[PDB]
Amino acid sequence: MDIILGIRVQDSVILASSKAVTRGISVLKDSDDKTRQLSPHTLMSFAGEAGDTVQFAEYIQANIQLYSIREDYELSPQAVSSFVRQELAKSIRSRRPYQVNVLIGGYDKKKNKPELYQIDYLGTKVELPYGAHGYSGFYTFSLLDHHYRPDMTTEEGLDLLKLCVQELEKRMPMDFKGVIVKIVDKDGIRQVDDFQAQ
Amino acid sequence: MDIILGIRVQDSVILASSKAVTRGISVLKDSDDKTRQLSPHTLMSFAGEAGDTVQFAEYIQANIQLYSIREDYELSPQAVSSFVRQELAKSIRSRRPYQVNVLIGGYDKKKNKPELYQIDYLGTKVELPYGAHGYSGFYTFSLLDHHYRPDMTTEEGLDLLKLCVQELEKRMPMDFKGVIVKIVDKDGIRQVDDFQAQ
Amino acid sequence: QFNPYGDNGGTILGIAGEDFAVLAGDTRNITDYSINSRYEPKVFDCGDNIVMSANGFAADGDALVKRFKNSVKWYHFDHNDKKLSINSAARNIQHLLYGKRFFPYYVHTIIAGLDEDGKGAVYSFDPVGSYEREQCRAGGAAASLIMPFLDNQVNFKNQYEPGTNGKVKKPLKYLSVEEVIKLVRDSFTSATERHIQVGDGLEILIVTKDGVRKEFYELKRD
Amino acid sequence: TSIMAVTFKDGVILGADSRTTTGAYIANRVTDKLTRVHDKIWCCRSGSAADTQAIADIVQYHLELYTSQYGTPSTETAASVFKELCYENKDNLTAGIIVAGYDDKNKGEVYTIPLGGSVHKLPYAIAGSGSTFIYGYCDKNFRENMSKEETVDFIKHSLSQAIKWDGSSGGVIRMVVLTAAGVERLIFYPDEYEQL
Amino acid sequence: TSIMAVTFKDGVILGADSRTTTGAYIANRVTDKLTRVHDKIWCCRSGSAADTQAIADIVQYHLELYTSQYGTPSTETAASVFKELCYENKDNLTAGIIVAGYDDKNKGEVYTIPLGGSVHKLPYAIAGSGSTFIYGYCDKNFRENMSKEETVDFIKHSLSQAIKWDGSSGGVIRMVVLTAAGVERLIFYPDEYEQL
Amino acid sequence: TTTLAFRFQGGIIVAVDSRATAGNWVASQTVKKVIEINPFLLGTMAGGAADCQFWETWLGSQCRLHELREKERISVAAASKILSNLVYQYKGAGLSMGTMICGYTRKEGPTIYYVDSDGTRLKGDIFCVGSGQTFAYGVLDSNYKWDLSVEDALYLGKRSILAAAHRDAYSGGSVNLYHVTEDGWIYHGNHDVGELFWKVKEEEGSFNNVIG
Amino acid sequence: TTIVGVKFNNGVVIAADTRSTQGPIVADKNCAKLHRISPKIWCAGAGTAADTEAVTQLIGSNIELHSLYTSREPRVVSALQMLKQHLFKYQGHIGAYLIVAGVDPTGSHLFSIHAHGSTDVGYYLSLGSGSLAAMAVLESHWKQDLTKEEAIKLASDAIQAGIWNDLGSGSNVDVCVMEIGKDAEYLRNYLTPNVREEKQKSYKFPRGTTAVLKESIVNICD
Amino acid sequence: TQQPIVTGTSVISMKYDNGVIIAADNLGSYGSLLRFNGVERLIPVGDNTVVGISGDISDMQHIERLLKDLVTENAYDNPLADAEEALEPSYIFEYLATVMYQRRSKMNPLWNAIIVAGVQSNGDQFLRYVNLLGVTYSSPTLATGFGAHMANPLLRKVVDRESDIPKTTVQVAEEAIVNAMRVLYYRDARSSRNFSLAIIDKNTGLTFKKNLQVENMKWDFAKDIKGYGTQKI
Amino acid sequence: SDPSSINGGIVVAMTGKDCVAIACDLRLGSQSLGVSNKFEKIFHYGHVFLGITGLATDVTTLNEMFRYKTNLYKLKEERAIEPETFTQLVSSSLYERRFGPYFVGPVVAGINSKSGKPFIAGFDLIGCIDEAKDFIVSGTASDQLFGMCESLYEPNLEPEDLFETISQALLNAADRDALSGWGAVVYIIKKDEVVKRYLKMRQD
Ligand SMILES: *C(=O)[C@]1([C@@H](O)[C@@H]2C=CCCC2)NC(=O)[C@@H]2CCO[C@@]21C
Ligand SMILES: *C(=O)[C@]1([C@@H](O)[C@@H]2C=CCCC2)NC(=O)[C@@H]2CCO[C@@]21C
Ligand SMILES: *C(=O)[C@]1([C@@H](O)[C@@H]2C=CCCC2)NC(=O)[C@@H]2CCO[C@@]21C
Ligand SMILES: *C(=O)[C@]1([C@@H](O)[C@@H]2C=CCCC2)NC(=O)[C@@H]2CCO[C@@]21C
């Protein structure tokens, strides 16, 4: 599977996602952005089955934007994640389930705290300081379990991730072509265009 | 599978072999040398099933060294390859066949010409200007079919390989951790310790 | 368990001339090692100067032809008796076939006629609707034995000008209906010798601006 | 299971063993395989106990409504309803049924509905695992127009043989006599038919 | 296949249909399933034609060598050799064999060797697909010490019934009579046994 | 099959082979693997012929309907998503298709979208689909430049298919070229691989291993 | 394949068709299914060609050695016992189905062996995919006390049934007559009812048509 | 999808100068058990058509009911039901063929092989076959199942091609057919000795013969056969 | 899976007037991947020629085996082996492996040095000899070869003519086979001389 990582620091949530898209024998793209902005302060990363992955992400995006217009309000991260969990928990018992795993990172403007949610394709949801999907957790969780601190600065979070990505690029068999990193905080979502060598 | 490449230029045979050894979820080693010197002017590269690979290579090495001592003579590359083909062709119909593919690169001191032999685990042997095993050929043969010339210098061969390795590192899904390159010519076998950036 | 499919053997051939087109097929219908009929027509005149054949699983081939003929009928009903051009028949058949994409008509279908410029035309179809206009196409049991022959004797493949050192290809002068019938007959007598499902009889339908004509020749019955 | 129906001079008789098994275990040793779908139209059940019961229950219902509207049904009509249910649902049923009825105009009649759902009118019929062993015996001893005593004897001997060889048959032999005189129930115990 | 052996007053008789099939096709309609392994020791073969032939050929060989050294073998001894081959090779054989022999001291004897390789000495025995249909008939009509004519009749009727119901049986009925008087071959055609 | 499409300064180059096989049997050496959706849109066909041919022709009809309704040329993004979403509706049914949707719109410029029957929709600069893809990628990757001329770009595509036609048993026949400009696509002929190989060999000096 | 055997008043005759197939392709249009075990003991084979052939030569070889050792003419029952015990041992894996006939010091014989090793005796027999067409004819025309000429006709007609009605059979009819007092006579191509008609055209190419890259002389003399 | 249970074997037929003949034995087998012997597998429809059916008997009985209804339905509001508008054999066949193919296409077939024999209103002979797959074909002779392998070769020796039809008389034809029935009783393990035969002649009409029997069989040579190779007695 | 469809390749032999010809393609692939365009499938031992299609490793092994056997034969017999004899040697050698056969399709061609009579023969993988008078085909494009031969062939062609015929049969059959081609070679054989010609063909 692809690399889906998330870390919640003091004032923001950081999501890192591999850029490779491999179809069989070839790597068709090395600049894929496995993320969708659900609202100004909520970002969702995803990995899973070929077509299902984007279709699901865009379907969720559409629904949140529609809610934002109807209510002229932005649902809290917790609210958006419960909506998403339910969508997957429905899908798990349907004719052809969505095989998609997601990380939802958002900044709750009312609580003034960042939040990271992990939800697999079964609709299993949990809130964590950091999380991942697939094999990624296996190589990185021991590094995060060690260096993680609730008061880390965004800069410290990016350094801890870099460490994670290096471990991944060393022991993982596949070339995931690096990751795209995005920060979500009180001011929105921005992309760290410089991680190819930060 | 691993990367096994061979190119026969004007006065030498060059063999490039991936350094990674992956066992399931982890890359256990990134400095593996998938080669065995059969005699001063003959080198054999190999890829295939976990244990069979080395056991076969060493078994062949033993036999050639024994022949060299008994006769105080070095068998021609063609001779060593026919011996190896036969060993595999026997194995293919045994209780538990050797699942190993090899490239045999040697410099025939009597003919004063380099020779490259490709033999798969079935005992299929062919002599070529360049060859490979596994998927490697799929990404590289179009590059070799294009730039290959019978009068290439060893330096031109190394540049053509570098090109092949780059294509491999771009489109192939797996991280094979680079290659180890060896040259075989009238003066023996030497390793190009500088290909990590040649 | 019940298998909804079967193989009735047979072989068909379609060749497009400059201003004519032929569609031939043996008349043997088989099941395994038995002959069901030594004469069971497989190439039909569907009106509007269009001949068609759906070879493979006869029940499917019959349904398709029957369904297409009925399509021609309604085409007239719905479009003030307009003539169904062969290119239009082709697209139509593609849809008939693709409609059963998930429970296909197990047949290789070929139609012949004249295009809108009076030129000879052959269209061969895939069991699920894929189609292409072609010069000549054999379909069915002996298809593999006949195509190589046609590539050589109709498109002069691999044939060069004597003395040119294979530097000059043999010119593609085009055949008359009489010369095409010869190739067709030889194609089948040869196929009859090497394939056990080919024989008994050969029926050819020839299409020209004057309509559809039929010729019949016997084939070995063993 | 061993079941049979035999037409004779005064009508027809039904017979059966009284064994229902689940593997080698005898779940019921006093089963009644002779089921009534109408006053003078009965059936013999073999195959699935659950399926044959459900089938019979439905036929009885159908014949009850038939009677309410058009009077007493012919034995042929009863066999037709059974047939309809067995043929149309052949994929989900395992029911071998023999229909036997007494008409005043037609006297006794026997219709056998085997597994596929086909219908066969015969002078007499046998069915069930135990029947295979008495094909020869019955073919040699059956005669048309036998007396009530002879017919009871034929059934008694035939079934005792079927019960003898077939582990899937046993218990007692039950019989139902259908004649103009009415409906008679007969039973024969081991100690009697085993030493015949 | 339908085969049987019956002991009687003067010895024993063997009988069989003459059909060998390969699916629904009759490969041979005049097959001889009555095989001689010794002058007055014969066998009835059912199951695999290839297996039963190979078995018989070997028993005949064994009994020939036995005779050369110890004189005429007892019917029991012949059955024992068959048994040895069938039991010890039960995994690779499909052979149902009935051994029948005439001894002067023992008169007629019948040993049946079913699939597993077990041996069973009986007054008479039946086997093969067709036998299932005549279990009841035979059990009801067999009697010990019957005359040659009665025994031929019993076999003729029994087999004709087996042939009647079993598609795997047919052709003619062959019989072999084994008595002190010698060895007699009998054959009965369709037109005769079909209307019995 | 071998099909490719790449973006560059002069628009988009589209090149395909023309071989059809069923097992080892060569059904045809003259098959069309490019569908002309309309004068501005091209589609490549890899995988199932019927599936690609059918749905890409249908795509054409949906695009036309769009332009009638919106009195405006349809975007490559939108045309590709119509196919993509249709295909996604059939996910699991067995459709088999690997495809490139190519166009040049004023709003988007040169645009290539990879669309397969798994439901994948990817926008990119270079794509190769088919059993010969790896061969074409080798040639393309080492000679591709955004500033290639329309003449050289066309040749690169033609050469890349040639490489694949040579090594891949399931590729060959002839090469079909296309150049896509904002004003529409321009067909650039049918090049028989047979003749093309010897010609390229001599003029280029490549394929030295083959005796000519 | 269609092979038959037919006894006549003073001997036996066996015959067979001449078609050899690989799946639906006719590999040999005139193979020979009649092999010799000894001068006067011949075999007709059906099933796996390599097996019928190999088995006929193995037992034939041993039958010769047995003959030489015993100073006697080989007997049909001997070839039959050697064949069946060999086939039995291989549990049907040697796909040989044979009709073995011949004359010897004890008379004239006709038998059949199946791959698994079982044998059968009769006055008329047939095996192979044509088995049923042939047998139908035999069941319809056989009678006891056939003359040599009648037996040949009957046997020959039986194979024709197969040639025409069975796709697994075709081409010609081979016969072999073994009479009690004379030499066995092998009649190769006793009937040839399937001659190919003259082609419609000649495909002789003009010399120089084929493009040649390199040419050289091959050395055969050491 | 189903599996046949009670089945009928071969159905043989051929056409002669003035009509067609068709036959089928009276057996209803149940696997290897020759269970039912009074089964008529020849269904006359009107007086110019006879439908012979092999395969699953329960389905045959269903085809029977369908045929009776066709006749009833054709009579409705049809003053020419017994004249210019009566059921032709080709109508009967096309109907059945239609049903057979629809049923296979719904993956629930009528497990049979059918031969429709008869004479068209203009005197033409009609002989066509249709089976559970909906496959159809015509030939001077037609047989189903076992008779396809053994009957066809015999019958074809009488009428090998179309031009032989006018040269074949009812006598010759009925003879060929009666002999074929004997051969089938010899080699088909699922056949009965009793059978029905029917002739549909453009002059004599429909002749339906019941309770025929295979006669004049050869079994005597059986006595001369003993052992399976070397045995002498 | 099918050992006979892994490497690809074809061979065809034809008889002419006092001559015989045997030809083959030069391809050796690994499924879809072309690997060698110089894998000749024709060999000879004395004046006897043997073509072999099928699994390449077995083609190589069999050639080595027959060289070995024909060498000892020459040493003992004191003469070179003949076509008819070699054919029997091939047959028995293959059958010897009846239940673990070599996956090949051999073809023998040559002229009897004493009778001058032309000879060709084919074998299935377990040695069954097919001795045709006209032509013999083998390989992944054998169906196509049968079609080509059955039509293009006529008896008693002269060497120069048979060359054209056999070459066109091989060429057009290979072009309808994904696994054949990449070069071809034709052997024209006469009592005294043997000419070997390489043909020019598509390389796709
Ligand atoms: C008989 O067919 C049998 C009965 O159990 C069953 C019970 C009641 C009425 C229908 C007949 N069916 C069975 O499955 C068992 C096993 C063998 O036969 C039974 C005894
Ligand atoms: C009988 O058991 C049977 C015979 O073919 C066989 C032939 C010769 C001697 C042994 C008995 N065996 C079979 O397999 C067939 C099918 C059913 O029974 C046969 C008729
Ligand atoms: C290529 O993808 C290929 C073509 O036959 C096919 C034909 C027309 C348009 C779509 C592409 N697809 C196939 O299934 C065969 C086998 C391998 O690839 C083919 C050559
Ligand atoms: C016949 O049995 C047949 C022959 O090819 C074969 C050839 C030579 C001697 C034995 C008989 N065997 C076969 O496998 C084919 C296919 C069907 O029957 C053949 C024609």
mmCIF file of N, CA, C and O in Angstrom, chain C residues 1-6 8 29 34-40 57 59-60 62-63 66 103 105 218 221, chain H residues 1 94 98 101 104-105 107 109 111 128 132-139 141-142 148-149 152 156 160-161:
data_model
loop_
_atom_site.group_PDB
_atom_site.id
_atom_site.type_symbol
_atom_site.label_atom_id
_atom_site.label_comp_id
_atom_site.label_asym_id
_atom_site.label_seq_id
_atom_site.Cartn_x
_atom_site.Cartn_y
_atom_site.Cartn_z
ATOM 1 N N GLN C 1 -22.806 -29.478 -14.389
ATOM 2 C CA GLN C 1 -23.609 -28.224 -14.427
ATOM 3 C C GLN C 1 -23.963 -27.901 -15.883
ATOM 4 O O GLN C 1 -23.304 -28.373 -16.810
ATOM 5 N N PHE C 2 -25.007 -27.107 -16.085
ATOM 6 C CA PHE C 2 -25.432 -26.746 -17.433
ATOM 7 C C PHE C 2 -24.516 -25.720 -18.119
ATOM 8 O O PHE C 2 -24.216 -24.659 -17.567
ATOM 9 N N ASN C 3 -24.075 -26.062 -19.323
ATOM 10 C CA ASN C 3 -23.225 -25.198 -20.122
ATOM 11 C C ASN C 3 -24.106 -24.648 -21.234
ATOM 12 O O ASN C 3 -24.529 -25.367 -22.133
ATOM 13 N N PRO C 4 -24.380 -23.347 -21.193
ATOM 14 C CA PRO C 4 -25.218 -22.665 -22.177
ATOM 15 C C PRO C 4 -24.597 -22.555 -23.564
ATOM 16 O O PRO C 4 -25.244 -22.071 -24.483
ATOM 17 N N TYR C 5 -23.358 -23.001 -23.724
ATOM 18 C CA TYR C 5 -22.691 -22.893 -25.020
ATOM 19 C C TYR C 5 -22.300 -24.217 -25.665
ATOM 20 O O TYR C 5 -22.186 -25.243 -24.996
ATOM 21 N N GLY C 6 -22.087 -24.165 -26.974
ATOM 22 C CA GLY C 6 -21.686 -25.332 -27.732
ATOM 23 C C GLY C 6 -20.890 -24.840 -28.925
ATOM 24 O O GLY C 6 -20.847 -23.632 -29.173
ATOM 25 N N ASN C 8 -20.478 -25.511 -33.036
ATOM 26 C CA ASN C 8 -20.959 -26.185 -34.233
ATOM 27 C C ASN C 8 -19.949 -26.227 -35.369
ATOM 28 O O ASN C 8 -20.289 -26.593 -36.481
ATOM 29 N N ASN C 29 -22.232 -28.731 -40.334
ATOM 30 C CA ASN C 29 -22.589 -28.343 -38.972
ATOM 31 C C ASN C 29 -22.270 -29.557 -38.113
ATOM 32 O O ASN C 29 -22.818 -30.643 -38.344
ATOM 33 N N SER C 34 -19.435 -35.754 -34.418
ATOM 34 C CA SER C 34 -20.579 -36.091 -35.262
ATOM 35 C C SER C 34 -20.967 -34.964 -36.196
ATOM 36 O O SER C 34 -20.770 -33.791 -35.892
ATOM 37 N N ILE C 35 -21.521 -35.334 -37.342
ATOM 38 C CA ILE C 35 -21.970 -34.362 -38.318
ATOM 39 C C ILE C 35 -23.471 -34.257 -38.118
ATOM 40 O O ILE C 35 -24.164 -35.278 -38.113
ATOM 41 N N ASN C 36 -23.965 -33.034 -37.922
ATOM 42 C CA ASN C 36 -25.397 -32.817 -37.730
ATOM 43 C C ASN C 36 -26.072 -32.643 -39.080
ATOM 44 O O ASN C 36 -27.197 -33.096 -39.292
ATOM 45 N N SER C 37 -25.376 -31.980 -39.994
ATOM 46 C CA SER C 37 -25.904 -31.763 -41.330
ATOM 47 C C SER C 37 -24.758 -31.485 -42.278
ATOM 48 O O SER C 37 -23.787 -30.830 -41.908
ATOM 49 N N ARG C 38 -24.866 -31.997 -43.497
ATOM 50 C CA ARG C 38 -23.840 -31.772 -44.498
ATOM 51 C C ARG C 38 -24.220 -30.513 -45.259
ATOM 52 O O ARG C 38 -23.421 -29.968 -46.022
ATOM 53 N N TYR C 39 -25.455 -30.062 -45.052
ATOM 54 C CA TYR C 39 -25.939 -28.839 -45.687
ATOM 55 C C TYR C 39 -26.877 -28.040 -44.778
ATOM 56 O O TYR C 39 -28.071 -28.337 -44.678
ATOM 57 N N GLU C 40 -26.312 -27.034 -44.112
ATOM 58 C CA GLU C 40 -27.047 -26.134 -43.218
ATOM 59 C C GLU C 40 -26.463 -24.750 -43.475
ATOM 60 O O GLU C 40 -25.462 -24.375 -42.878
ATOM 61 N N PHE C 57 -21.147 -20.705 -32.226
ATOM 62 C CA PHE C 57 -22.224 -21.422 -31.558
ATOM 63 C C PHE C 57 -23.491 -21.081 -32.328
ATOM 64 O O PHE C 57 -24.059 -20.011 -32.161
ATOM 65 N N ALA C 59 -26.736 -21.636 -32.244
ATOM 66 C CA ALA C 59 -27.931 -21.034 -31.645
ATOM 67 C C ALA C 59 -27.718 -19.518 -31.543
ATOM 68 O O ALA C 59 -28.618 -18.727 -31.841
ATOM 69 N N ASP C 60 -26.524 -19.114 -31.130
ATOM 70 C CA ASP C 60 -26.225 -17.695 -31.007
ATOM 71 C C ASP C 60 -26.132 -17.048 -32.386
ATOM 72 O O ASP C 60 -26.664 -15.966 -32.597
ATOM 73 N N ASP C 62 -27.631 -17.870 -35.085
ATOM 74 C CA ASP C 62 -28.975 -17.739 -35.654
ATOM 75 C C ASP C 62 -29.732 -16.572 -35.046
ATOM 76 O O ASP C 62 -30.339 -15.772 -35.765
ATOM 77 N N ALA C 63 -29.694 -16.473 -33.721
ATOM 78 C CA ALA C 63 -30.372 -15.389 -33.023
ATOM 79 C C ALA C 63 -29.860 -14.045 -33.516
ATOM 80 O O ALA C 63 -30.645 -13.155 -33.810
ATOM 81 N N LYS C 66 -31.012 -13.342 -37.143
ATOM 82 C CA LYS C 66 -32.451 -13.129 -37.061
ATOM 83 C C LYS C 66 -32.739 -11.745 -36.455
ATOM 84 O O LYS C 66 -33.618 -11.009 -36.924
ATOM 85 N N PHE C 103 -22.876 -11.876 -21.301
ATOM 86 C CA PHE C 103 -23.461 -13.178 -21.628
ATOM 87 C C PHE C 103 -23.533 -13.110 -23.140
ATOM 88 O O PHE C 103 -24.613 -13.144 -23.729
ATOM 89 N N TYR C 105 -22.835 -13.527 -27.381
ATOM 90 C CA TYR C 105 -23.253 -14.378 -28.474
ATOM 91 C C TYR C 105 -21.889 -14.974 -28.803
ATOM 92 O O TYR C 105 -20.969 -14.254 -29.190
ATOM 93 N N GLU C 218 -19.107 -28.639 -54.022
ATOM 94 C CA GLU C 218 -18.997 -29.727 -53.060
ATOM 95 C C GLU C 218 -17.602 -29.763 -52.443
ATOM 96 O O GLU C 218 -16.631 -29.299 -53.044
ATOM 97 N N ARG C 221 -16.407 -35.214 -48.017
ATOM 98 C CA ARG C 221 -17.322 -35.572 -46.937
ATOM 99 C C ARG C 221 -16.774 -36.441 -45.800
ATOM 100 O O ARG C 221 -17.542 -36.962 -44.989
ATOM 101 N N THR H 1 -30.746 -23.853 -14.030
ATOM 102 C CA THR H 1 -29.897 -25.036 -14.334
ATOM 103 C C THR H 1 -30.408 -26.199 -13.528
ATOM 104 O O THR H 1 -30.675 -26.080 -12.340
ATOM 105 N N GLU H 94 -40.855 -23.823 -35.180
ATOM 106 C CA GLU H 94 -40.351 -22.499 -34.858
ATOM 107 C C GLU H 94 -40.761 -22.089 -33.440
ATOM 108 O O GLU H 94 -40.017 -21.406 -32.735
ATOM 109 N N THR H 98 -38.058 -21.538 -30.481
ATOM 110 C CA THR H 98 -38.074 -20.266 -29.775
ATOM 111 C C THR H 98 -38.015 -20.480 -28.274
ATOM 112 O O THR H 98 -37.221 -19.849 -27.586
ATOM 113 N N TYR H 101 -34.577 -21.946 -26.960
ATOM 114 C CA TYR H 101 -33.522 -20.947 -26.851
ATOM 115 C C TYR H 101 -33.753 -19.925 -25.728
ATOM 116 O O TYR H 101 -32.808 -19.448 -25.101
ATOM 117 N N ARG H 104 -32.762 -21.673 -22.488
ATOM 118 C CA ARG H 104 -31.330 -21.833 -22.248
ATOM 119 C C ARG H 104 -30.749 -20.468 -21.906
ATOM 120 O O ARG H 104 -29.829 -20.360 -21.105
ATOM 121 N N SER H 105 -31.309 -19.423 -22.498
ATOM 122 C CA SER H 105 -30.807 -18.080 -22.256
ATOM 123 C C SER H 105 -31.145 -17.585 -20.862
ATOM 124 O O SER H 105 -30.578 -16.613 -20.387
ATOM 125 N N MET H 107 -30.817 -19.630 -18.434
ATOM 126 C CA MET H 107 -30.090 -20.616 -17.644
ATOM 127 C C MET H 107 -30.987 -21.638 -16.939
ATOM 128 O O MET H 107 -30.671 -22.127 -15.863
ATOM 129 N N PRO H 109 -32.913 -24.554 -18.834
ATOM 130 C CA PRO H 109 -33.389 -25.282 -20.014
ATOM 131 C C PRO H 109 -34.379 -26.407 -19.837
ATOM 132 O O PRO H 109 -34.588 -26.917 -18.730
ATOM 133 N N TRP H 111 -34.496 -29.819 -20.681
ATOM 134 C CA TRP H 111 -33.466 -30.807 -20.972
ATOM 135 C C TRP H 111 -33.829 -31.866 -22.013
ATOM 136 O O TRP H 111 -33.883 -33.065 -21.712
ATOM 137 N N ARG H 128 -36.738 -31.200 -38.846
ATOM 138 C CA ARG H 128 -35.769 -30.316 -38.217
ATOM 139 C C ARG H 128 -35.592 -30.682 -36.743
ATOM 140 O O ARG H 128 -36.508 -31.199 -36.090
ATOM 141 N N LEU H 132 -31.857 -28.579 -26.022
ATOM 142 C CA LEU H 132 -31.775 -27.729 -24.835
ATOM 143 C C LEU H 132 -30.929 -26.465 -25.009
ATOM 144 O O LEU H 132 -31.114 -25.501 -24.283
ATOM 145 N N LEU H 133 -30.001 -26.457 -25.958
ATOM 146 C CA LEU H 133 -29.187 -25.259 -26.187
ATOM 147 C C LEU H 133 -29.871 -24.315 -27.168
ATOM 148 O O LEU H 133 -29.432 -23.182 -27.347
ATOM 149 N N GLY H 134 -30.941 -24.789 -27.809
ATOM 150 C CA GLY H 134 -31.637 -23.966 -28.784
ATOM 151 C C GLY H 134 -30.999 -24.082 -30.163
ATOM 152 O O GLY H 134 -31.316 -23.328 -31.072
ATOM 153 N N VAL H 135 -30.087 -25.036 -30.305
ATOM 154 C CA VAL H 135 -29.405 -25.286 -31.562
ATOM 155 C C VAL H 135 -30.359 -26.020 -32.513
ATOM 156 O O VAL H 135 -31.106 -26.915 -32.091
ATOM 157 N N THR H 136 -30.341 -25.641 -33.790
ATOM 158 C CA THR H 136 -31.232 -26.263 -34.763
ATOM 159 C C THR H 136 -30.550 -26.569 -36.083
ATOM 160 O O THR H 136 -29.630 -25.868 -36.504
ATOM 161 N N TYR H 137 -31.014 -27.629 -36.733
ATOM 162 C CA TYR H 137 -30.478 -28.020 -38.026
ATOM 163 C C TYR H 137 -31.365 -29.042 -38.732
ATOM 164 O O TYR H 137 -32.218 -29.707 -38.113
ATOM 165 N N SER H 138 -31.173 -29.125 -40.046
ATOM 166 C CA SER H 138 -31.910 -30.054 -40.877
ATOM 167 C C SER H 138 -30.982 -30.921 -41.702
ATOM 168 O O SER H 138 -29.893 -30.492 -42.087
ATOM 169 N N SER H 139 -31.437 -32.141 -41.974
ATOM 170 C CA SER H 139 -30.680 -33.103 -42.756
ATOM 171 C C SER H 139 -31.667 -34.174 -43.219
ATOM 172 O O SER H 139 -32.690 -34.396 -42.570
ATOM 173 N N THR H 141 -31.650 -37.055 -42.822
ATOM 174 C CA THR H 141 -31.840 -37.970 -41.689
ATOM 175 C C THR H 141 -31.445 -37.203 -40.427
ATOM 176 O O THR H 141 -30.597 -36.307 -40.481
ATOM 177 N N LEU H 142 -32.067 -37.544 -39.305
ATOM 178 C CA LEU H 142 -31.770 -36.890 -38.042
ATOM 179 C C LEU H 142 -32.032 -37.858 -36.907
ATOM 180 O O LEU H 142 -33.049 -38.561 -36.887
ATOM 181 N N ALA H 148 -27.569 -40.883 -32.971
ATOM 182 C CA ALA H 148 -26.822 -39.960 -33.812
ATOM 183 C C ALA H 148 -25.564 -40.660 -34.262
ATOM 184 O O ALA H 148 -25.093 -40.464 -35.383
ATOM 185 N N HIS H 149 -25.032 -41.498 -33.382
ATOM 186 C CA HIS H 149 -23.807 -42.205 -33.684
ATOM 187 C C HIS H 149 -24.019 -43.486 -34.471
ATOM 188 O O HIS H 149 -23.249 -43.785 -35.388
ATOM 189 N N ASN H 152 -27.772 -42.659 -37.718
ATOM 190 C CA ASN H 152 -27.430 -41.823 -38.854
ATOM 191 C C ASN H 152 -26.562 -42.497 -39.899
ATOM 192 O O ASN H 152 -26.834 -42.379 -41.085
ATOM 193 N N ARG H 156 -28.118 -42.926 -43.542
ATOM 194 C CA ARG H 156 -27.434 -42.145 -44.570
ATOM 195 C C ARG H 156 -26.960 -43.000 -45.735
ATOM 196 O O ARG H 156 -26.572 -42.474 -46.780
ATOM 197 N N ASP H 160 -28.129 -40.457 -48.794
ATOM 198 C CA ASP H 160 -26.866 -39.791 -48.506
ATOM 199 C C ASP H 160 -26.935 -38.290 -48.773
ATOM 200 O O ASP H 160 -26.292 -37.507 -48.078
ATOM 201 N N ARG H 161 -27.689 -37.888 -49.788
ATOM 202 C CA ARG H 161 -27.846 -36.471 -50.079
ATOM 203 C C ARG H 161 -29.276 -36.208 -50.513
ATOM 204 O O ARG H 161 -30.062 -37.140 -50.651
#
